[PDB]
Design a protein around this nucleic acid. Structure first.
Ligand SMILES: [Mg+2]
Ligand SMILES: [Mg+2]
Ligand SMILES: [Mg+2]
Ligand SMILES: [Mg+2]
Ligand SMILES: [Mg+2]
Ligand SMILES: [Mg+2]
Ligand SMILES: [Mg+2]
Ligand SMILES: [Mg+2]
Ligand SMILES: [Mg+2]
Ligand SMILES: [Mg+2]
Ligand SMILES: [Mg+2]
Length: 180
RNA sequence: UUUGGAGAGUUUGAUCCUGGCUCAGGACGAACGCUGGCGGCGUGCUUAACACAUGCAAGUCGAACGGAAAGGCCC
């Protein structure tokens, strides 16, 4: 089960000595809803071929989201492409607050609570690149502590330890219910 | 040690950037246009600090005095 979405459809054109040659380009985002993200950019002369190319490229290119239970770990300032997209977690149930392309990519990621803002070049392609880079910039507390050579309690806050323990207990309960 | 950030259209044969405009949101001591049933609770000259017909919005003491004009009683 994968989540599919389309963000923008553009009628690109090419010129020859005879006249105008039209073409179609599409960008799609694929995700499993658990924290696995794939982006695809596909070009054709017709929408079905375009979306097929986009889906294939997205299937080729994947990326994993290290989310804590339901939300993001820490605020991230994703500076890439030409747009500035700033992501940070929030209180559970607040919702994934983001623009169009960011909305699509985060919903395909499966996150449920995020605060986002795009600060320039509202173009969908650049926004998607900036969000992907923002997720790449994300760091996870366990291997952050491993890199720093200091144990978890001496690195990460007790509140996020409590949240992680609650998330682990909920995941264990869900696994038990699914097995039974 | 806890609470809360959305964008989209629009320059080009085509796109990327910058950059400008516009729209989706809430609010008013508001008004005009159609329509219109009641009840409760608020609000009411933002301009002309312009002139204002009439009547109201500042009175109380005989246990302060002299008195009795108008009411009472008694000859
Ligand atoms: Mg910078
Ligand atoms: Mg901008
Ligand atoms: Mg914009
Ligand atoms: Mg709050
Ligand atoms: Mg234009
Ligand atoms: Mg130009
Ligand atoms: Mg044009
Ligand atoms: Mg009424
Ligand atoms: Mg009233
Ligand atoms: Mg008078
Ligand atoms: Mg007096």
């Amino acid at each position: 089960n994968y989540i599919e979405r389309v963000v923008s459809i553009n009628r690109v054109s090419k010129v020859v000595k005879g006249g105008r040659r039209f073409s179609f380009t599409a960008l799609v985002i694929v995700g499993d809803g658990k924290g696995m993200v794939g982006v695809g950019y596909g070009k054709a002369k017709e929408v079905p071929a375009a979306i097929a190319k986009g889906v294939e490229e997205a299937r080729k290119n994947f990326f994993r989201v290290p989310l804590i239970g339901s939300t993001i770990t820490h605020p991230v300032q994703g500076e890439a492409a030409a747009g500035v997209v700033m992501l940070r977690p929030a209180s559970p149930g607040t919702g994934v607050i983001a623009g169009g392309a960011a909305r699509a990519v985060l919903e395909c990621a499966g996150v449920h609570d995020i605060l986002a803002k795009s600060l320039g070049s509202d173009n969908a392609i650049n926004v998607v690149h900036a969000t992907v880079a923002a997720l790449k910039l994300l760091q996870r507390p366990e291997e952050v502590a491993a890199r720093r050579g200091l144990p978890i309690e001496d690195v990460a806050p007790a509140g996020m330890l409590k949240a992680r323990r609650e998330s682990e207990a909920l995941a264990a309960a869900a696994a038990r219910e699914g097995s039974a």
